Amino acid sequence: NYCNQMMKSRNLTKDRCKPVNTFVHESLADVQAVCSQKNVACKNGQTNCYQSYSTMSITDCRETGSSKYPNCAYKTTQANKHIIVACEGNPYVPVHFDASV
Amino acid sequence: ETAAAHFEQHHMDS
Ligand SMILES: [Cl-]
Ligand SMILES: [Cl-]
Ligand SMILES: [Cl-]
Ligand SMILES: [Cl-]
Ligand SMILES: [Cl-]
């Protein structure tokens, strides 16, 4: 499926199985734009999180309960949802993907 | 890689 292929290609699962990851089907600049959208609290207590005004096309890749390295197995779910990212730096850009809603 | 580069590699699929 898409998740198994992309998780491997993007170097998430070549050397382990990662429980969850999200891919966003939008331009890089459209996701970078989220760091000047709605400032929200982060779960970690920090306050450098931002939520997109709009929903975006996203695929969630979630490992199955029985999956184990090397043969990682993913459930694929497609949705249109808002994204929440942590931003840092100069330029002030996304550095972590937090949630989708 | 930078944290920013990692983010784009791990999450973006334009
Ligand atoms: Cl592992
Ligand atoms: Cl994620
Ligand atoms: Cl792009
Ligand atoms: Cl903070
Ligand atoms: Cl952070």
XYZ file of N, CA and C and ligand atoms in Angstrom:
350
model
N 0.852 -1.141 0.000
C 0.000 0.000 0.000
C 0.922 1.235 0.000
N 0.323 2.372 -0.168
C 1.007 3.650 -0.149
C 1.874 3.840 1.122
N 1.302 3.543 2.287
C 2.041 3.778 3.560
C 3.303 2.926 3.611
N 3.199 1.643 3.301
C 4.368 0.790 3.385
C 5.456 1.361 2.436
N 5.091 1.668 1.176
C 6.054 2.239 0.221
C 6.662 3.577 0.645
N 5.833 4.510 1.038
C 6.344 5.836 1.384
C 7.116 5.872 2.721
N 6.685 5.080 3.679
C 7.397 4.968 4.979
C 8.815 4.474 4.753
N 8.964 3.524 3.845
C 10.262 3.007 3.505
C 11.039 4.054 2.725
N 10.449 4.587 1.638
C 11.155 5.560 0.824
C 11.657 6.776 1.550
N 10.833 7.288 2.469
C 11.217 8.498 3.206
C 12.023 8.184 4.413
N 12.535 6.974 4.560
C 13.443 6.611 5.621
C 12.854 6.696 7.002
N 11.621 6.192 7.106
C 11.013 6.020 8.406
C 11.088 4.619 8.896
N 11.130 3.648 7.988
C 10.989 2.297 8.366
C 12.074 1.391 7.742
N 13.087 1.986 7.125
C 14.221 1.204 6.694
C 14.965 0.578 7.858
N 15.016 1.218 8.979
C 15.782 0.718 10.148
C 14.939 0.511 11.410
N 13.611 0.627 11.299
C 12.702 0.316 12.363
C 11.291 0.319 11.830
N 10.322 -0.022 12.666
C 8.916 0.286 12.306
C 8.441 1.412 13.234
N 7.994 2.493 12.635
C 7.429 3.631 13.327
C 5.932 3.444 13.538
N 5.410 3.670 14.754
C 3.993 3.404 14.949
C 3.011 4.241 14.106
N 3.312 5.542 13.920
C 2.415 6.430 13.191
C 3.173 7.491 12.445
N 2.682 7.866 11.262
C 3.186 9.018 10.580
C 2.123 9.540 9.640
N 2.156 10.832 9.406
C 1.218 11.534 8.560
C 1.932 12.164 7.358
N 1.345 11.951 6.152
C 1.802 12.604 4.941
C 0.747 13.601 4.506
N 1.227 14.749 4.081
C 0.317 15.889 3.681
C 0.490 16.069 2.180
N -0.638 16.000 1.498
C -0.716 16.140 0.052
C -1.000 17.567 -0.350
N -0.092 18.477 -0.036
C -0.180 19.918 -0.345
C 1.211 20.388 -0.707
N 1.377 21.559 -1.246
C 2.698 22.076 -1.496
C 3.527 22.348 -0.255
N 4.851 22.264 -0.387
C 5.690 22.575 0.826
C 5.387 23.982 1.313
N 5.279 24.930 0.416
C 4.995 26.319 0.851
C 3.654 26.483 1.473
N 2.665 25.705 1.081
C 1.391 25.802 1.756
C 1.404 25.248 3.199
N 2.222 24.252 3.471
C 2.377 23.775 4.838
C 3.295 24.718 5.617
N 4.339 25.280 5.046
C 5.172 26.250 5.742
C 4.323 27.463 6.154
N 3.326 27.792 5.321
C 2.418 28.944 5.672
C 1.708 28.754 6.954
N 1.575 27.560 7.487
C 0.863 27.319 8.749
C 1.534 27.985 9.940
N 2.865 28.215 9.907
C 3.536 28.889 11.017
C 3.207 30.340 11.257
N 2.437 30.917 10.326
C 1.848 32.262 10.576
C 0.350 32.255 10.626
N -0.233 31.117 10.885
C -1.714 30.978 11.003
C -2.061 31.021 12.516
N -2.869 30.081 13.002
C -3.414 30.219 14.375
C -2.507 29.640 15.452
N -1.958 30.432 16.369
C -1.073 29.962 17.413
C -1.930 29.199 18.408
N -1.525 27.995 18.753
C -2.224 27.199 19.694
C -1.199 26.625 20.700
N -1.727 26.211 21.852
C -0.892 25.462 22.834
C -0.480 24.127 22.265
N 0.707 23.707 22.640
C 1.236 22.372 22.329
C 0.932 21.487 23.548
N 0.737 20.208 23.300
C 0.547 19.206 24.359
C 1.719 19.160 25.299
N 2.923 19.400 24.758
C 4.153 19.372 25.590
C 4.320 20.539 26.550
N 3.414 21.514 26.511
C 3.425 22.686 27.346
C 4.005 23.893 26.648
N 4.673 23.703 25.507
C 5.238 24.822 24.821
C 4.104 25.511 24.126
N 4.406 26.620 23.513
C 3.406 27.415 22.794
C 3.863 27.900 21.386
N 4.692 27.071 20.785
C 5.154 27.311 19.376
C 4.375 26.432 18.304
N 3.151 26.081 18.672
C 2.282 25.267 17.772
C 1.325 26.140 16.988
N 0.939 25.716 15.806
C 0.121 26.443 14.902
C -0.796 25.461 14.244
N -2.061 25.920 14.108
C -3.122 25.217 13.415
C -3.556 25.848 12.154
N -3.697 25.050 11.084
C -4.070 25.548 9.745
C -5.495 26.083 9.784
N -5.683 27.206 9.068
C -7.048 27.716 8.902
C -7.943 26.740 8.189
N -7.423 26.116 7.118
C -8.118 25.222 6.218
C -7.855 23.745 6.583
N -8.708 22.852 6.081
C -8.373 21.482 6.075
C -7.394 21.203 4.908
N -6.578 20.159 5.035
C -5.651 19.700 3.993
C -5.854 18.235 3.769
N -5.423 17.769 2.601
C -5.446 16.341 2.289
C -4.294 15.631 2.966
N -4.644 14.632 3.756
C -3.615 13.935 4.504
C -3.882 12.428 4.449
N -2.783 11.675 4.523
C -2.849 10.221 4.687
C -2.164 9.924 6.055
N -2.916 9.195 6.861
C -2.378 8.707 8.124
C -1.953 7.232 7.920
N -0.707 6.940 8.345
C -0.136 5.634 8.291
C 0.058 5.145 9.703
N -0.640 4.101 10.074
C -0.628 3.598 11.427
C -0.280 2.138 11.343
N 0.711 1.756 12.134
C 1.125 0.379 12.170
C 0.047 -0.505 12.739
N -0.113 -1.703 12.223
C -0.974 -2.702 12.843
C -0.451 -3.233 14.172
N -1.297 -3.860 15.002
C -0.859 -4.319 16.313
C 0.201 -5.403 16.349
N 0.074 -6.254 15.386
C 1.038 -7.354 15.167
C 2.298 -7.023 14.343
N 2.409 -5.887 13.723
C 3.518 -5.510 12.855
C 4.775 -5.562 13.682
N 5.837 -6.048 13.078
C 7.173 -6.020 13.674
C 8.245 -6.012 12.619
N 9.314 -5.339 12.932
C 10.435 -5.195 12.034
C 11.023 -6.578 11.690
N 11.384 -6.819 10.424
C 11.505 -5.838 9.345
C 10.264 -5.568 8.530
N 9.281 -6.441 8.642
C 8.134 -6.414 7.755
C 7.041 -5.547 8.343
N 7.235 -4.259 8.355
C 6.255 -3.357 8.976
C 4.940 -3.429 8.162
N 3.832 -3.324 8.840
C 2.528 -3.362 8.171
C 1.769 -2.146 8.640
N 1.229 -1.388 7.684
C 0.518 -0.137 7.963
C -0.937 -0.250 7.512
N -1.842 0.351 8.312
C -3.213 0.752 7.934
C -3.161 2.151 7.366
N -3.769 2.338 6.214
C -3.827 3.608 5.565
C -5.207 4.250 5.675
N -5.262 5.483 6.138
C -6.493 6.267 6.242
C -6.272 7.638 5.563
N -7.200 7.975 4.661
C -7.175 9.264 3.960
C -8.240 10.183 4.524
N -7.920 11.456 4.705
C -8.876 12.454 5.245
C -8.501 13.808 4.804
N -9.494 14.674 4.918
C -9.278 16.093 4.812
C -9.404 16.678 6.200
N -8.316 17.182 6.794
C -8.293 17.696 8.107
C -7.340 18.820 8.312
N -7.612 19.584 9.385
C -6.728 20.677 9.718
C -5.437 19.994 10.262
N -4.339 20.709 10.112
C -3.071 20.225 10.702
C -2.518 21.167 11.777
N -1.803 20.567 12.726
C -1.186 21.264 13.853
C 0.316 20.913 13.765
N 1.181 21.910 13.655
C 2.604 21.730 13.600
C 3.320 22.624 14.622
N 4.536 22.228 15.015
C 5.411 23.004 15.871
C 6.349 23.738 14.931
N 6.621 25.010 15.157
C 7.457 25.828 14.362
C 8.661 26.358 15.153
N 9.777 26.586 14.483
C 10.982 27.017 15.228
C 11.901 27.591 14.210
N 12.784 28.484 14.533
C 13.888 28.867 13.691
C 13.660 30.214 13.039
N 14.713 30.602 12.343
C 14.655 31.698 11.406
C 15.217 31.270 10.028
N 14.359 31.098 9.008
C 12.935 31.265 8.898
C 12.168 30.391 9.890
N 10.992 30.853 10.273
C 10.147 30.155 11.246
C 9.263 29.154 10.504
N 9.653 27.886 10.598
C 9.142 26.801 9.745
C 8.756 25.618 10.583
N 8.017 24.694 9.976
C 7.630 23.508 10.709
C 8.790 22.603 11.016
N 8.802 22.087 12.235
C 9.846 21.139 12.669
C 9.241 19.875 13.257
N 7.942 19.861 13.631
C 7.300 18.673 14.097
C 5.884 18.717 13.713
N 5.327 17.528 13.447
C 3.932 17.325 13.084
C 3.189 16.798 14.291
N 2.195 17.517 14.795
C 1.570 17.130 16.075
C 0.296 16.390 16.083
N -0.651 16.904 15.324
C -1.974 16.324 15.207
C -2.665 16.733 13.883
N -3.724 15.992 13.585
C -4.615 16.340 12.539
C -6.081 16.214 13.058
N -6.914 17.234 12.680
C -8.282 17.574 13.170
C -9.180 18.299 12.163
N 20.401 15.495 9.032
C 19.615 16.688 8.512
C 19.099 17.654 9.612
N 18.710 18.870 9.222
C 18.008 19.795 10.140
C 16.686 19.233 10.514
N 16.115 19.775 11.587
C 14.743 19.420 11.980
C 13.743 19.823 10.914
N 13.973 20.953 10.292
C 13.116 21.410 9.181
C 13.160 20.481 7.987
N 14.349 20.045 7.640
C 14.561 19.073 6.488
C 13.950 17.738 6.799
N 14.089 17.285 8.049
C 13.496 16.061 8.441
C 11.983 16.138 8.303
N 11.438 17.254 8.758
C 9.978 17.415 8.661
C 9.457 17.268 7.201
N 10.141 17.947 6.277
C 9.676 17.910 4.901
C 9.810 16.494 4.321
N 10.934 15.833 4.591
C 11.150 14.461 4.147
C 10.141 13.475 4.747
N 9.757 13.685 6.011
C 8.930 12.723 6.686
C 7.426 12.954 6.442
N 7.053 14.164 6.112
C 5.632 14.477 6.003
C 5.116 14.978 4.694
N 5.922 15.574 3.850
C 5.382 16.187 2.626
C 5.282 15.239 1.435
N 4.142 15.244 0.815
C 3.945 14.480 -0.430
C 3.108 15.274 -1.385
N 3.676 16.328 -1.915
C 2.890 17.318 -2.644
C 2.078 16.740 -3.811
Cl 11.462 -1.474 15.394
Cl 2.895 12.266 12.276
Cl 6.245 21.586 -3.196
Cl 7.315 27.824 23.765
Cl 9.375 22.117 19.000
